[PDB]
Swiss-Prot record:
Subcellular localization(s) per the UniProt record: Secreted
Tissue specificity: Found exclusively in skin. Produced in sweat glands and transported to the skin surface.
Keywords: Allergen, Disulfide bond, Pyrrolidone carboxylic acid, Secreted, Signal, Transport
Family: Belongs to the calycin superfamily. Lipocalin family.
Predominant location: secreted
Biological role stated in the UniProt entry: Probable pheromone carrier.
rRNA-binding is among the record's keywords: no
Disulfide feature: 38-42, 57-148
Gene3D superfamilies: 2.40.128.20
Transport among keywords: yes
Pfam family, one: Lipocalin
Protein name stated in the entry: Allergen Bos d 2
Amino acid sequence: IDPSKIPGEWRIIYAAADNKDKIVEGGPLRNYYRRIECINDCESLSITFYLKDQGTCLLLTEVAKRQEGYVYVLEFYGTNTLEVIHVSENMLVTYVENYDGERITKMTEGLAKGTSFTPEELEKYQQLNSERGVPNENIENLIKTDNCPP
């Protein structure tokens, strides 16, 4: 984890979750990333993304506060803990636990600088999912349905 690689223009390639309904088209956790900013050394993260809501691309910017290390807290369709578990020049993987007042959803997001992952990057992402109990069969390719403004 090189914290300096966190801010930047990122595209979301994949999302995986135990409660798949949360990430399918029309799900509250299907978020089309555009950019991540660090508020003066990343004590807080400013995340800008599109939510395809009501057949409209809605631009949203949410702020997550650092809790400990690279674990941040964010209120977004419930309470969330977002952890940066892997960050490189071209790849970023987040681990999110969302509590909607009824159930906890464990999910991951694989972001890239490009529009895809090489087999080696996908192998790593799938491995990080297994370690957390997030089913690889529940993987969704988000960039293929990202028709929101670039």
